[PDB]
Each structure stands twice: as structure tokens, then as C-alpha cells.
Symmetry: D2
């Protein structure tokens, strides 16, 4: 059986946007949608499958139970809940941590033995929990890490220099948030590193690097303020990841990888460039970032760890 089967848990804005991006790109052969709200999951499957005759790939789409994970190649997790009046932000994390653990159990219980792709927030945390609960090797639990932040980073640079975003090569490291690292020292465009555009070409200036960096950090806020939520950007990032896994591409993507000394941190999943293939994450690419960039990464991972301890299971 060469048929590729992907299960998407959670049929909200994110799950359905991922599914649609996958169908239009023709990435998988079978998409199973799972959601506590069975009617919603069915309504989505119906709608997503309607236009297939006009598509470039013949993808099967249907709503189902966890039994379907038994022979799935990979399971994408996006299921979660909203902020409820009467609960703190941490309360919410423990809630999504509980939900993610419940799902991970049902999935494993079906005899699933593929690869996990964690997209629900907070990704780094839930990725770590999925790892513990699943009992699977770290490399087979892939979080979305900083793929969205990285694509936004490239978008901003492309807009500034008027170049194809696919021609920008740089990354956003760490955990998504105020402490994410915009690794300018390791960002290039056509072979020319950003700091060369600055120092030697004088095409950009330090201030620009700061402005661009902030835009990435504030991207979710600007979007959420205008359309209530963000999901298209993440839909494409997740599909990119699934693509690299299913096609054993051995491509580099800044996903959530289990660190074991790289960047000077260990025992946590965070966003860093990594080689992705059919077995998950093969290895991390340890960039020799500047002391300022690394101190910012350390800080980023520190905050990550604080929260992780507040929910982590022994």
C-alpha cells in the first residue's frame, strides 16, 4: 500500500485550513477528520470533498473515529479550547495539556505507529507532552516550531528587498513570542547575508532589522485584530512539514526538535532548523549564532521551561 493517510484531529479554523491547503497542493491521498463535535467534522469533510473533481489530486476525505489512526502515516493535532471566563492563562494551558494527552492516548490505543505533527498551542509544550504520553522516540513527534514565524520573517524581508520569499534564507529560533530570536546573523538572500546588505552594501540599516523583527513578533496581533484569528499562514506551514515527511525530502525546516546540547540547551522541544524525513526529525542544525542571539535563545528556552514544569508529567 503506497497510499498516504493523514489524520487531522480538530476541525476548527486551523485543522480545516491545513486540510484545504493539503488538498489544493495534493499532498496526501487520504484525509480523515476527527473532532469531538462529530457533526462539524462531518460538515467539513463534506465541503472539503465536494470540489475534488476540479482538483489536481484525487484525495479521499471523510469524518471518522480514532480507529482510523491504526494505519495512518501521520497524525496532525490541532484540537483545543478557548479562553474561558474564570480561568487564568495557565489554567488554559493545563486544559489543552489535558486534552492533548487524552487524544494522544486514544490514538496510540488504535495501534497507530506513524508520525505526530503537533500544531495546537502552545506547540513546544504540547509537543513535549505528546512525546511523554506517546512513549515514541522524540524524532517522531514533530511540532510546528517556528515555521510560521520563519515564513513571516521571510515575507517581511522579501517585501523590504522586493524579492521572492522563497529566495530568502534565514530563521526565527526558539519559542514563538516576545523572546523569539530573529537570527539575522544566519539569514541570506542570494548568498548575501543580511549583515552584508547592511555593513557593506548599505541597503538596510540596523533599525530596519529591528522593525522587521518586531513585525514578525507582532504578526499574530495585527491579523487577529483585523480578522479574529490566524490560520492560513499556519495551514501552509503545517502542510510544508507534512510534505517533507511523507516524501522523505531530508529538507531543513525550523520545526520543534528535541534538543540534546545544541544551541547550549537540552531536554525540550523548541524551534530550530532541522533535517526532516520519513522518520520525523533526523538531526538539528546547530547554528553558531552571535552571543546576543544566543543569550536571547537561552532566555526564550528559560521561559519555555518555567511553564513546561507547571504542567509536565513525571
Amino acid at each position: 500500500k503506497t497510499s498516504r493517510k493523514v489524520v487531522i484531529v480538530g476541525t476548527g479554523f486551523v485543522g480545516t485550513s491545513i486540510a484545504y491547503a493539503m488538498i489544493n497542493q495534493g499532498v496526501a491521498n487520504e484525509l480523515v477528520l476527527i473532532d469531538v463535535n462529530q457533526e462539524k467534522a462531518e460538515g467539513e469533510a463534506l465541503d472539503l470533498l465536494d470540489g475534488m473533481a476540479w482538483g489536481e489530486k484525487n484525495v479521499s476525505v471523510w469524518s471518522g473515529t480514532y480507529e482510523e489512526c491504526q494505519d495512518a502515516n501521520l497524525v496532525i493535532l490541532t484540537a483545543g479550547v478557548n479562553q474561558k471566563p474564570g480561568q487564568t492563562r495557565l489554567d488554559l494551558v493545563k486544559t489543552n495539556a489535558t486534552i492533548t494527552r487524552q487524544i494522544v492516548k486514544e490514538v496510540m490505543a488504535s495501534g497507530f505507529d506513524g508520525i505526530f505533527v503537533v500544531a495546537s498551542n502552545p506547540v513546544d509544550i504540547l509537543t513535549y507532552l505528546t512525546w511523554q504520553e506517546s512513549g515514541l522516540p522524540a524524532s517522531r513527534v514533530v511540532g510546528t516550531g517556528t515555521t510560521l514565524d520563519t515564513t513571516r520573517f521571510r515575507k517581511e524581508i522579501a517585501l523590504k528587498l522586493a524579492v521572492d520569499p522563497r529566495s530568502v534564507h534565514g530563521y526565527i529560533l526558539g519559542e514563538h513570542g516576545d523572546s523569539e530570536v530573529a537570527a539575522w546573523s544566519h539569514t541570506t538572500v542570494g548568498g548575501k547575508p543580511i549583515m552584508e546588505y547592511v555593513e557593506k552594501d548599505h541597503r538596510l540599516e540596523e533599525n530596519d532589522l529591528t522593525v522587521l523583527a518586531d513585525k514578525v513578533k507582532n504578526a499574530a496581533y495585527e491579523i487577529i485584530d483585523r480578522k479574529k484569528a490566524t490560520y492560513y499562514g499556519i495551514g501552509m506551514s503545517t502542510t510544508r512539514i507534512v510534505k517533507a515527511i511523507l516524501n522523505n525530502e531530508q529538507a531543513v525546516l525550523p520545526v520543534s526538535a528535541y534538543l540534546n546540547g545544541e544551541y547550549g540547551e537540552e531536554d525540550i522541544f523548541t524551534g530550530v532548523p532541522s533535517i526532516v524525513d520519513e522518520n520525523g526529525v533526523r538531526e538539528i542544525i546547530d547554528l553558531s549564532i552571535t552571543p546576543q542571539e544566543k543569550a536571547m535563545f537561552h532566555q526564550s528556552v528559560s521561559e519555555l521551561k518555567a511553564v513546561l514544569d507547571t504542567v509536565r508529567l513525571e
Copy 2:
């Protein structure tokens, strides 16, 4: 200037789903988003452009004014209001008509000299008003017609026979509704006419054809019932039309075409197999459908004419 520029007026579920489908399939090089709610339009443009680095094509996306329609290749109309508890189904058509008319006036005033793709409902009626208001040749105003019902029709057959939806060839003719015609006499799979499957192989029973036809007729209700609305099917159908035009494909699509005697009807836009190229609709394929199928088609157009008469400009 080979860059293909498409403008999408209306940034709701339909317009953004068409945009997303286009981006992921890699159709068009420039997508301009326009909406009376300008903030929503920007939120969508920001979110839609965010993942372009992870895409298979470089598409520029941004929110703008009607002045962008000047050098645009084609404008997709999706704007309009939706049935509210406090109004009539005819009041709705009247409002959407007014909205579409005003929009077409702005577009034309921009200097736009391309092709119109009408996706907002009621499509056939609105397609007609866009034609009347633009002053353009009927072939330059292409409505989605029955592309959605047709891909739904093919889906149902695909599930029934366990074949590829794209390996099914037949159409839903006329106006979408309990009036639409399921052209069974001209539907084949792998060269075999449906009626051949019925009157020789006997794999299908007459009742099955009635059931499948009805599922196509209730598809939207089945979906709206579960997810408040439908948009993924139309996003793919519209993208298919846009792809055929931009690439001068000369392919057959059941879009809203101006009948001029075909099927025994005239002075009306409705869903029928048509050849689509870079100049819009070149011609209509006039299927020698059974007297029963034609009776239904006539009833579908009569209903269409009735409502239209209460809105026609002149």
C-alpha cells in the same frame, strides 16, 4: 507584462477560500483583495501572504482599492449579504443585486477591461446584472453556473462506483436548486454511459439515480446544517474556472453562459457545458438531452426568468 493579476471583491468565507485555493494551486501571480470592510481585507491579505515562503508558487497578495482593477486580468465577485431572519428571499436578491451593480460600476470606472467571474448568489441573476451594468460582451462575464453542483454530482457517482471523481464525466444543468437538471443521459464513466450501467450491466438501478441526484440537490443544506455554511467546494470550482481562462485552455466547464437558442432557451445566463478560454466563454455545447431532462431545464430557466424580471436593469 506576463504577470497574471486577479482581483477578488468580497473577503468572506467564499472570497478567502478562493484566494487560498488559488495560492495553494499556484494560480495567478497577483491577488488583490477588496472589501467594504477594509480592515477585514487587510487581515486576510496579511494572513494569506504569511505562508508564501512555504508555497509552491510566488503569489503577491494585498488589500486595495478599485483602482487596482484597471490593469487586472479578471475580477471575481463574491460580495453580498446573506439571508437574515428579518427579510424576504426576494429582498435578499434585491440587496445583493444592488451591491453587485454598485461594485461593477466602480470596477468599470477604474478602467478595467478584462473578464468577470461571478461567484456570488444568486449567480445566474447576478451574472446577468453584471453583464447589463458592465456593457461588456456576454462572453466576458462568466458565472460559476453549475460547476459546484457538477463536482458534487461527480463526487456522489465516484463514491457509488468507487472510482476517481475526475474519471466521471457528466453535468448538472440549469440553475442550482430543486430545479437543476441531472443530465444522466449524457453522463459516462470510463466511456460507459450511465444508462448502460443501468440497462445492460444492471449495476445501477433507476432509483439510485434519483437518490444521487437528490443528494446533489440537498448538498448545501446537509453542509450548512453542520458548519453554518459552505465555501470549500466553491473555492475549488471558481479556481478551476479562473485557471481555464488565464491559460486559454479551451476546456469544457458548466459555467453561467449566455444562451442564444441552445437548449431551446434565450436571453438568459445559466449552467451548461461551455468552452472556456482567455476571452471568456467561446461557445456552448448543446447536449441532445432527453425530452424529460429538457422539460426540467425549461422549468429551471422559467423560474430564473421570473425572478430576474423583477431585477433586470432594462
Copy 3:
């Protein structure tokens, strides 16, 4: 493992054209090239893999031994020899029959448990021998049948009507050659039967149908006369077949399928619309063609068996 690996045996115009079509379409993830001419196979793999950085997919391409077939999903056969003076046109069929047969032996020896796609001519004949030698279910030995004739057929109709080839839906049935059947009774465009175009639309006339059917039958001669050989057309047909199998599309293609009564014939592989999936050919779609089209089909199959009996192995 989700990595799709395909082996192409024989790196001539056809085999390399298929490889190039696959790379540019991004059909498989691993592409192994095998040829008796060791050096040629490597040279090809080198040139083919060279441009992968500018490709839309990351395909691994390399030349190897039949060992690679152990874990391959599909093995495409395109190996054979040309006409040798003093040799009969039938002697050649026997020669290629023993060549593909020997190859199938090597492949099965490696542990291969995938699907075969036979492209070397005569396709229906070699498909049969691969089935016999391989000892695999008929459904897992897929010959290109009339996919090439069918695509040419659609091209001619598309040219004549100024329509997208992908918008033409008809088939060429039987064995490629002087007896192939232009199944005009079951050919449509926009849902309209060609006969409706003729009889009711007066868009086409019976004479056109004859001229077009001959253009299909004489296509190879026409091209060979200008560029010595044909390979792009078949390259694209084989890739389509490959695409449908790996993706379990359940698509209809006129591949070489084992008949068991369909069309009134049995016990031979021949070109007919069939449902293709990840397990090869699932079932045949038996078209109720006219008696004239069926008489010609029967004729086509009869000549197929005549030659088949002069090379067929004793048992499967």
C-alpha cells in the same frame, strides 16, 4: 516507510524519457536506473539528477543492480533490442520476449513484491510473458496498452474541435496496430457523443472519423520518419499509469488488462479502459461498443493470440 521507489529497466529513449517526465512531474521519490549497458545507466542517472535543485520535487536518482527491486514499489520495463539484419520481424519479438523474460527473472530473484508496468513492444505480448514468468496475479502486471494511442486519439479530436485534450473522453481499444479499434461509439466531448456531433450538430462528418482514426494508426510512422523514433508520448503515458498506481487513484486508463469474457474475449492482456489503483488493475470496464467496433476488436485479439502462441511460455 512512505518513500515511493520506482525502478526503470532499460535506459534508452523511452526509459529516460519516462524518468524525465517523472522527475518534472514529481511522481516518485526514488528513481533507480538499470541497464545492461552499465556506463549508459550511470551517465543517464548523472544527467537526470543534475537539475534536481531547480525541480519542484526532491527525487533521488541513481543507477543500480536488481537488488534495488527488493523494496521497489513499481518496476517499469522498457528494455529490448533493435532489428538485426538477416533476422525475421518475428525473430525479434522472440528475442525481446526472452530479454524481458530474463529481466523479470532477475527482478523476482531480488525479492520484488510490487507492481510491474510493461512499456516495451509488443506491449500486450511482453505483458503476458511478464505475467507468466513473474508468477504474479494478472492484476499486478500492468501493460501500457493503448494509453498512447488513446492520448493521440484525444489530441487529433482536440485539434479538430479546438478543445482541451483533457476535455476529450474516448478510447482506442485492443492491440496497437492496423487492427486497433477507434471506439467512436463511446467518445465524448463536453458530454456530447461524437455521433451527436456528426448526426445532429453536423460539426463533423463520417469521413472525418475515418481520417482521424488513421492519423492515430499512422502516428508512429509519421513521427519516426521525422525524428527516427518516438518517446515523449509514451514517456507521458507511462508516467500517468505510474501516477495512478502509487496514488491509488481508482482512475480509468486503457492499460493492458487480463480479459475474462469482457468484450467477448479471454485469456490475453489487451488495451481496454480499466480501473487502476495501488494494487494494479482492479477491474475492466466492458463497453457495449457497436458490432462493427466489436468485430474489429475480435480481429485485433485474434492476431494477438496468433503471435502470442509463438512465444508464450507453457505455464504461468
Copy 4:
């Protein structure tokens, strides 16, 4: 008219491979094939169009005369000859130069007012001649430059590191040959510079970079040694360039761009990372390469000028 028309002059292994790549990748809507041997051009048009029903896109393909260039968006030149017995390499260049100059004149005489993509070797030399003859802005004459050497350069690295070739980001600069520069200083994988792999991770040794550079420098010979000629690699490289122009991508490709100070050279077309859009080459990206690399680059551009001045108009 949104239909994109491409004319390919020369229907040999290169021209036909490019057309096949474009068809399968679904680039362009009309492919016109022109060749002095009008029967061969017809035979290829027939064989190429034959499998369209099975394609991902609907591409029209036909053989024609230069009149087809009038409303063409892009014209690709692959026409040329190969060596013979006692024919100097300068003889080959001189004739392919006369052939290319004739062709361009025919194309321009047709009313053509689009972009030229020069894939016939010596590309840099012929690109310059095409530029001189046409009278079109230097930016509307795009040669394949080092796109092929660059994709080979990425392949070797990819093989060496076991990563996706599309994840490697480095370039070969100058003119193809023993003069070509393997700019290691500005090559990265996953954002990590090659020299970081050497100097810090130690995963790569100085020597390693030499072998690779040479595997790339000798790539052609190695292929011509086993299959008589090369075309699949150039077929894809050219399709990439064509796709970047037609879709106004603003992508960076090491095409043949008119230097005008960059890298310290001027009045010459050579391979350097440039930004490509619907108007051709918009600008060159002047990498700050190491003195060695720039010396090697200078060497390369110097040899090019020598030979150019012989057939230069």
C-alpha cells in the same frame, strides 16, 4: 491575451529536453518549435504534443517559422553545432556565433519584442552577441550562466551531507569551466555556512571542498563520457529561468547578467546571482567574496573577454 507563448529555436537534445521539461512542469501555454531542419522540428512537435491528454497542463505545441516570434513572450536559443575532426574550439565558437547571429536577426525581423533566453554554448559569449545583434536592453537577454553548474554544485553538497538539494544555497560564479568559481564563502545549508561546517563543526575538511568543486568542474566530461552528451540538467535549469521570468518571480538565479562594476568587472555577461522578473534581469547581487574567489573570478572573466573579442561585433 494571458496565454504565454515560448519559441524554442533548435530542436536537438537540448531544445527538446527543455520543451519536455516545460510541458511536464506545466510552464507556458504555447510552445513553438523552430529548426533549420524543418522535418525534425515537425517530428518533435508531433511526439511532444501526443501525450498532452495525460499531462498536468494543456500545452499547445507546433513547428513553425520565425513569424511566430512576432507575438511571442520569450524566445529560447539552443541552436548550434558540435566539434568535428580537426576543428579548433575557436572554429566551433565562430560558427555557432554566426548561426546565433543569423537566428537573432530573423527573430527581430519578425517583430519580436520580448525576452531572449540563451542556452546555446558558449552561453556567455553568445548571450553577448545576442545582445549586440538584437539592440534590446542588456536586461532582456538572459543567458543560462551558471545555473547548471550551480544545481550540480548543490547536488554534490546534498549528496555529501544527505540533505534536500533545494536546501543548499550557494553558487558557481563566472563562466563555466576550469575558471568557474565555487563560492564556498557564501554557501549555506540550513542557514549554516559551509565554512562553519569546516572550521567549527569540522564535519567538512578543506580537501572535501576541493573534490566537490572539481566533481562539478568535470561534471560534463563525466556525462559525455558515458552518454555522448548532456541535456537533462540544462533542460531543467532553463525551465527554471523561464518560469521565473513569466511569473515575474523576482527570484535569484545565477543567469548570464551584464556586469557593470559588480565583482570588479564590466561590459560582459557572466554568471552571477541576479534577480529575475517578467522584464528579465533586474539586478545583480554583488557578493563580497574572498580575494581568492575574486581572483579566480577575475581569471574567469578575463579568459571570456579574450575569446569574445574574436567574434565580438
